[PDB]
Subunit: 326 residues, 3 copies
Amino acid sequence: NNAMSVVILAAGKGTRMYSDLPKVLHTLAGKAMVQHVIDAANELGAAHVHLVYGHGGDLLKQALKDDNLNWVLQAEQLGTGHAMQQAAPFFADDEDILMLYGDVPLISVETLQRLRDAKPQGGIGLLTVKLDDPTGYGRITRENGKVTGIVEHKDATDEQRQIQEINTGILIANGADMKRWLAKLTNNNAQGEYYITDIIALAYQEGREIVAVHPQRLSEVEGVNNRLQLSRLERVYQSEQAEKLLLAGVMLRDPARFDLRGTLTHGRDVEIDTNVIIEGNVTLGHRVKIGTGCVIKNSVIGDDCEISPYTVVEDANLAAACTIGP
Amino acid sequence: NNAMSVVILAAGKGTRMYSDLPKVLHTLAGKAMVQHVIDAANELGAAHVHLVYGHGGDLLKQALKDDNLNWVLQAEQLGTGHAMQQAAPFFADDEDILMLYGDVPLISVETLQRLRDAKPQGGIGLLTVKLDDPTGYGRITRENGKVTGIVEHKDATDEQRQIQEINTGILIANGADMKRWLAKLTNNNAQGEYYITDIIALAYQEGREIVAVHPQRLSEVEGVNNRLQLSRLERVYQSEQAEKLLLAGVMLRDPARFDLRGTLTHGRDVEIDTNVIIEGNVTLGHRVKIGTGCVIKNSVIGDDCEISPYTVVEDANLAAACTIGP
Amino acid sequence: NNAMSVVILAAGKGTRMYSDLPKVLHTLAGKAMVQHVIDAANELGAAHVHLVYGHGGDLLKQALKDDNLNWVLQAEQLGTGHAMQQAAPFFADDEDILMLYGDVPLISVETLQRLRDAKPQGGIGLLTVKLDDPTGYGRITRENGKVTGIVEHKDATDEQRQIQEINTGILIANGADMKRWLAKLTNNNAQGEYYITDIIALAYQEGREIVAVHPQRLSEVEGVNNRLQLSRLERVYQSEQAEKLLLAGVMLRDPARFDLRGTLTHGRDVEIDTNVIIEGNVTLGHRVKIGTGCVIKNSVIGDDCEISPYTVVEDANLAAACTIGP
Ligand SMILES: CC(=O)N[C@H]1[C@@H](OP(=O)(O)OP(=O)(O)OC[C@H]2O[C@@H](n3ccc(=O)[nH]c3=O)[C@H](O)[C@@H]2O)O[C@H](CO)[C@@H](O)[C@@H]1O
Ligand SMILES: CC(=O)N[C@H]1[C@@H](OP(=O)(O)OP(=O)(O)OC[C@H]2O[C@@H](n3ccc(=O)[nH]c3=O)[C@H](O)[C@@H]2O)O[C@H](CO)[C@@H](O)[C@@H]1O
Ligand SMILES: CC(=O)N[C@H]1[C@@H](OP(=O)(O)OP(=O)(O)OC[C@H]2O[C@@H](n3ccc(=O)[nH]c3=O)[C@H](O)[C@@H]2O)O[C@H](CO)[C@@H](O)[C@@H]1O
């Protein structure tokens, strides 16, 4: 496991959110989208986390003040490659540089670790997915089964557009190699921007190998640009967590009407009825029964406690065998 | 945009509802199904709205008393054509007559306007949809790509039954032409009723042109005959509205657990948690936060107000920056 | 309708539930899974109900104390055939013996009755379903369209594994014939256990006929082994009941957010809003309106009563025309 840092590109506008709050700060389960990415980067072992931002550096820096982030300003939004070029001076030649988006909140550490493992030496580990309709996304080009480059939809021909495997945007490479390819990025293409994706053809040309890996679930690489798409991920997220809990032994009367917005520690034989929301750090002891519609926030509920329907439990530590409610 | 009136056929029984309330009066989002149709007719610009009813004229007339409807009694239920014949004497030869059903609540003004635009002169604008299983519905007959008539399922052969394009029942034509074809309607067919659908073959025979248009969504032409089907539309409706709101900038913690039953006016960055119900006319100022499970009814909530979970806000105007709840 | 008894095999471990409560005792709508099976057996007319258990006989016997069950201990879990062999001494030669699983809670009396009707004389009535992926399930073998036996996945070849029709495990036969085949069960196969499924080849060999019947819905033969699968059935169950109620004339504002956990008696034109839970025996008179999120438990609510949102009605009989709530 060679040392590694992570770069999060969170400099895009976020126009379709119609909000005075920077897009990547909007929450997915009570945690800003970008914090999800940052948490994933850190659990993965990132020695440094470079956050590339456009404006709102103040809102962003204030919100993310409790994180050891290296702030990298991308003055104008001239493409992913350009955003990467601003961060380059900070990559260490002795480490791998993994790149992530600040608006793709569900990327898992498991998938990123598999990406790290698939990155050949001097090569690029790329995360790709085969879509039914690949429209609008970078097409993966291959030659005798080997990745040779990425062609942006707008730059692709009608023939290349038929390619289904597309770029999720996440990739990893050695920092020295990264610096070198970044320096060679050109800006004349269908959109006059520096494409980080051009580094693929550049690595292939240098004779280096690009290995594509695939994500476990497609939602794991879904980017958010408006609230409708954020709500869809909130559901995928909530639902994925409800199932883990059911499988781990917590009875959810309806996993579709359960919301975990923080961290739940639970005992054995816990029962949670419908429309229950768990916020912040919550601990549920053994055989705790949560009535329908309760909101439990930053609390600790002792073993055998029963909480009646619609109770809000907040900032509390409840003694075992409690009966909270009529 | 030639002047136009609308006829709503709401005279059928409604037996499978098992209710002492006339079927078309049952609500879809707090509004009787037929009111939805009536509202759609009016927003479309209908100069007159003819409501064709069987019995319950009293319940119906009482309920819909605040509407300028022209009541047209259909003594016995002898088919859509017969119901139309009762309304005919009221069509003006100088206007288009659009026909709608009182139990197809989600027909959109957008689709109806496209129908109006597709109605050739002296011709008929018809709304049709291609179904996977067209069983039970009028089959659209064509000759060299042109609509020639409609054959009712029961009247169709095994060969014609294979036709997938069916009649949604909604159509528009000039009133003079309508009067004329209505007068020629016959009642000897598989069901001994006057079929309004026979006017299609009649218009084709007179050398006039029938143009079929399609609805944006299939739910838009779904008729309700029992509560199960009404509940399905309530969901399609609620869900369609939740998405509009998300796309317009209102954060819904779960668009699947949100119910708008009236009219919502909102500011920027409003947050609405799960299981919230909005009834009647509601106004939500900027950055208002609605806790899970609140019911907000005919209220105005000032900017920055926060409403705690499960609060019922009714008949109230709440001053800005209010904190309603523990 | 020849006399008949039922054997419920509920002796398996239940390891993936991670609970100190025997798996078949976990509730599906407030009723232990096995009680569902037992209720189905009794409504079907079972003269005796043999419950085959491994351990927890005490928890099980205590929980099911109000049922006239004949307890049959299966000392070690050596296969369905072995579990059946323990119960055999109790089958009467003059009755049919229907076999069910204690962890397949949604089997319907309708489907079981059709199974009884399809059981030839001296033959076996078998319940089978064609799956897309039949992996892990007993394959149904046929010869010229006739059932000849069942081959367990692990015992099947690659060719037999292609068979899609699988054994749901439910079957019925004469007790005398059952005793006889059970006595001949062998334990040398891919899993060294007594397979009740071997009785099929045994019945075919004796020249007797095996008739396969299919369940109305696949969920009806779904077995539960972990809480995630139990939650999925709770939803199928709740949803199936919500639709019956809608079709029977009760308006559910959202059949997806309705939970019946007991028995509901209702009048005409009852309205139940979202997130309502009905527990125990509940009676709703005519035109009762239940506000969103109410919990009604072992109560009787008189005609025309209106219950405000989030009210818990428990152990109460409410006089007609009551207004419970602000
Ligand atoms: C040239 C390139 O990289 N193309 C890929 C990129 O395209 P594409 O450039 O179209 O994607 P986006 O514009 O959404 O940008 C992706 C991410 O980069 C950030 N961003 C973008 C521009 C900028 O100047 N600064 C910045 O920080 C955004 O905030 C977002 O987090 O993502 C797609 C996945 O969604 C891939 O299928 C495309 O192959
Ligand atoms: C002959 C005819 O028109 N056939 C069409 C009609 O059939 P069909 O006659 O079978 O449809 P319905 O019986 O449901 O009636 C449709 C509408 O007309 C009303 N109504 C019906 C009979 C009556 O005497 N008075 C009255 O007002 C009903 O209340 C309902 O609003 O609708 C279908 C769509 O659902 C179309 O696919 C069929 O091609
Ligand atoms: C040999 C046999 O019967 N195979 C069938 C059985 O397999 P299979 O043996 O794999 O199924 P399970 O192990 O789940 O057991 C089925 C039922 O029998 C009970 N049980 C099992 C073993 C035991 O010693 N005692 C006992 O009581 C379980 O508690 C459960 O209620 O069910 C499948 C459906 O799920 C069928 O497709 C298989 O063809």
